[PDB]
Design a protein around this ligand. Structure first.
Ligand SMILES: Nc1ncnc2c1ncn2[C@@H]1O[C@H](COP(=O)(O)OP(=O)(O)OP(=O)(O)O)[C@@H](O)[C@H]1O
Ligand SMILES: [Ca+2]
Ligand SMILES: [Ca+2]
Ligand SMILES: [Ca+2]
Lengths: 125, 357
């Protein structure tokens, strides 16, 4: 029984960029107006879907860890990344991103730049 | 529908147990069952140790593998009732297992949970995988060293690579026993089971891993500063010198113990080499320590040197020593069993019974 989450049903259906925040052991969409501004107290999962010439979709999954995110948040971000990859039949390539040391590919998803801000959602622990 | 999972991490030396969502196990007790030497039928954990005079003590888990099922069931009963005060038949349960645990073993544990304890749902997790998740990673190699066994476990995009897992029969109890042995140099004759517990605590309090063993032997001989003291239960003081770093040196030089085995640095390297060349950089860059025997001061620094020496010079060696790593298996289980998706991961009792079974 492949593991499903309601957000998994929305994931990777069209080319684009989707960002979720870990909140209390769940995967919650980030409001699109706030894309690119990451709370240093939180952990996030990011799916970039690209349309390939052959017609198929390419998937890159990144989990981003803020410098003050709690251990439940970073652990859940890692696990939800695995589960979303599995839901995509294993086809996604997974990437760990740490605040201030992100890959150039990840940074490049944000036109107006990758930024950080203070705060974050309360720890589940 | 509203129900919190129990998380049980089964070790050779200690059981760690508690409730999903807690940041640490609230129940930690020795994995020991005592039964009358000659006429309960059985006693568990801390209480068994207080009745050693009239009980024969046994360890139901040997090198991470459950090997005495009747006594293991006593441990699980103690866990649910005495420690947690939980009805196992009313909670999902996450149980952990050793890397490379045979499927037949996993099945017996499953049969006991569903048919002895009537658990409504259960999930079995590999210990090293839970530790990696607790560190916020999906790819890396976990070095998990406990009381009875050490494993090196390469994990890629969430899953262990079975062909690359190493088992090493060398862990904390061997180190405790080695310290008991070398303390004879200074006139101590620790040998009883009770004395072993005392020496275990000495080891934990005073030992450390040298950055370079030969250089540490040299420097420690030049003065008495190496010497550090420990207050015994009877109020006497013991002083320990170079035994402080010679004891855990056996992790790197198992010949100290009369073992032919490779040390933990060599084993980690060999485990990485079993994986295809294209993923090794992510393993070398994410060597994650787990378990009580990884708690020695100096371990990260020493492993970094020694693995760097063995590995290709193009690799980027990073040894990660999380401060909570002692119970990172249990913590990873607490996180996993708290997720909104956990209910889709488990096996239900009805499914098991109709499989069947
Ligand atoms: N601070 C410390 N320094 C050194 N060793 C320690 C420390 N704390 C605990 N240990 C050792 O760790 C061991 C217990 O670790 P752990 O609970 O991870 O093992 P386990 O799960 O019972 O065993 P295994 O994983 O081998 O089946 C004991 O040998 C103990 O003495
Ligand atoms: Ca947070
Ligand atoms: Ca994949
Ligand atoms: Ca263990």
């Amino acid at each position: 029984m492949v593991v499903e989450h309601p957000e998994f049903l929305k994931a990777g259906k069209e080319p684009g960029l989707q960002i979720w925040r870990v909140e209390k052991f769940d995967l919650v969409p980030v409001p699109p107006n706030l894309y690119g501004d990451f709370f240093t107290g939180d952990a996030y999962v990011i799916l970039k879907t690209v349309q390939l010439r052959n017609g198929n979709l390419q998937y890159d999954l990144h989990y981003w860890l803020g410098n003050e995110c709690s251990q439940d948040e970073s652990g859940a971000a890692a696990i939800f990344t695995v589960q979303l990859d599995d839901y995509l039949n294993g086809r996604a390539v997974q990437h760990r991103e740490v605040q201030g040391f992100e890959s150039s590919t990840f940074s490049g998803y944000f036109k107006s730049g990758l930024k950080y801000k203070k705060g974050g959602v309360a720890s589940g622990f | 529908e509203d129900v919190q999972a129990l998380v049980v991490d089964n070790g050779s030396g200690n059981v760690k147990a508690g409730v999903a969502g807690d940041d640490a196990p609230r129940s930690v007790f020795p994995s020991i069952v005592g039964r009358p030497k000659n006429p309960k039928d059985a006693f568990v954990g801390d209480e068994a140790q207080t009745k050693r005079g009239i009980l024969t003590l046994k360890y139901p888990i040997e090198h991470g593998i459950v090997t005495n099922w009747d006594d293991m069931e006593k441990i699980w009963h103690h866990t649910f009732y005495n420690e947690l005060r939980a009805a196992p038949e009313e909670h999902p349960v996450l149980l952990t297992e050793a890397p490379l645990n045979p499927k037949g073993n996993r099945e017996r544990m499953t049969q006991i949970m569903f048919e002895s304890f009537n658990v409504p749902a259960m999930y079995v997790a590999i210990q090293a995988v839970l530790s990696l998740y607790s560190s916020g990673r999906t790819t890396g190699i976990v070095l998990d060293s406990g009381d009875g066994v050490s494993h090196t476990v390469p994990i890629y995009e969430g899953y262990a690579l079975p062909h690359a897992i190493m088992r090493l029969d060398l862990a904390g109890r061997d180190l405790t026993e080695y310290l008991m042995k070398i303390l004879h140099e200074r006139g101590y004759g620790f040998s009883t089971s009770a004395e072993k517990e005392i020496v275990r605590d000495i080891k934990e309090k005073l030992c450390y891993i040298a950055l370079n063993f030969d250089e540490e032997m040299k420097t420690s001989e030049q003065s008495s500063d190496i010497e550090k003291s420990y207050e015994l239960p009877d109020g006497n003081i013991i002083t320990v010198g170079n035994e402080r770093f010679r004891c855990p040196e056996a992790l790197f030089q198992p010949s100290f113990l009369g073992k032919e085995a490779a040390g933990i640095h060599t084993t980690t390297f060999n485990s990485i080499k079993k994986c295809d060349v294209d993923i090794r950089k992510d393993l070398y860059g994410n060597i994650v320590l787990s378990g009580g025997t990884t708690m020695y001061e100096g371990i990260g620094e020493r492993l970094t040197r020694d693995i760097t020496t063995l590995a290709p010079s193009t690799m980027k060696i990073k040894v990660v020593a999380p401060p909570e790593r002692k119970y990172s298996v249990w913590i990873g289980g607490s996180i996993l069993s708290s997720l909104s998706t956990f209910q889709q991961m488990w096996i239900t009792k009805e499914e098991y019974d109709e499989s069947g079974p």
